[PDB]
Design a protein around this ligand. Structure first.
Ligand SMILES: Nc1ncnc2c1ncn2[C@@H]1O[C@H](COP(=O)(O)OP(=O)(O)O)[C@@H](O)[C@H]1O
Ligand SMILES: [Mg+2]
Ligand SMILES: [Mg+2]
Length: 261
């Protein structure tokens, strides 16, 4: 299926990516609405992450799950690569958080459940996402959560490419050790905290300070966080990955059970 730019009407920018913007688009013959993720070849090769784009396309295009953003295909011209994505109409969880400041236990527990199901599907194929953060979690038309942006994804066992914000990454990842599916379990913990609290647990004004905080696993909870939430988060944010629970154990955690829709 050989798409070209001329097959689409392009609309407003949906968001700012690292290598270009994502655009709302409509396919001219079908009137199918979708999102077009633009990446400038010059910038990709300079950054030396052409392998990340390849992985994104190959991994994301084969995954089929209601809580994973579909990638339908891709094309390119002289200066740009274009990923054809499922359009997520309700935007990002990042925007949702900045709108609401923090989520109640019901919305949080529900998003964690959707995330845990999507991750169960991924890990079953040994695909680890490694970049689960609010800006890569999109919302479908029913408000259902969708994992997107599989550029950091890899098949497990893996090493690590250079980084960005460290906030959502486990110690093994930042330190460049070998790592596996348990990476995403840590990230789930960070997200549960951020959804409840409004900021990630290792937030600091410096990368170096964040790194220290993550490596020592130093975080505390505001008083409003409940004991069930604390219990879940404390179980997920373990320095030793082998001590992190399996996703099954998260899905059946009493706090998740009592609060998830
Ligand atoms: N399919 C989509 N539907 C709606 N918005 C999207 C979609 N895909 C990406 N976006 C928006 O564009 C931003 C960047 O997209 P992303 O795929 O994460 O690029 P990058 O790999 O550079 O992070 C997202 O954080 C989101 O705001
Ligand atoms: Mg992204
Ligand atoms: Mg990306």
């Amino acid at each position: 299926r050989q798409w070209a730019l001329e097959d689409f009407e392009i609309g407003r920018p949906l968001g700012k990516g690292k290598f270009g913007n994502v655009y709302l688009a409509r396919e001219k013959q079908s009137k199918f609405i979708l999102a077009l993720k633009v990446l400038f070849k010059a910038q990709l090769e300079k950054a030396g992450v052409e392998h990340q784009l390849r992985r994104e396309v190959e991994i994301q295009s084969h995954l089929r799950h209601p809580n994973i953003l579909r990638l339908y295909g891709y094309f390119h011209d002289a200066t740009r690569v274009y990923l054809i994505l499922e359009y997520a109409p309700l935007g990002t969880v990042y925007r949702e958080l900045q709108k609401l400041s923090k989520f109640d236990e019901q919305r949080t527990a529900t998003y964690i459940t959707e995330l845990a199901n999507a991750l169960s599907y991924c890990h079953s194929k040994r695909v680890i996402h490694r970049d689960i953060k609010p800006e890569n979690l999109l919302l479908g038309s029913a408000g259902e959560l969708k994992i997107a942006d599989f550029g950091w994804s890899v098949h497990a066992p893996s090493s690590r490419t250079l980084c960005g914000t460290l906030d959502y990454l486990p110690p093994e990842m930042i330190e460049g050790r070998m790592h596996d599916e348990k990476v995403d379990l840590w990230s789930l913990g960070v997200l549960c905290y951020e959804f409840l609290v409004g900021k990630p647990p290792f937030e600091a004004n410096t990368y170096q300070e964040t790194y220290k905080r993550i490596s020592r696993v130093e975080f505390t909870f505001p008083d409003f966080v409940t004991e069930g939430a604390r219990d879940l988060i404390s179980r997920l944010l373990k320095h030793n990955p082998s001590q992190r629970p399996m996703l099954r154990e998260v899905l059946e955690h009493p706090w998740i059970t009592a609060n998830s829709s």
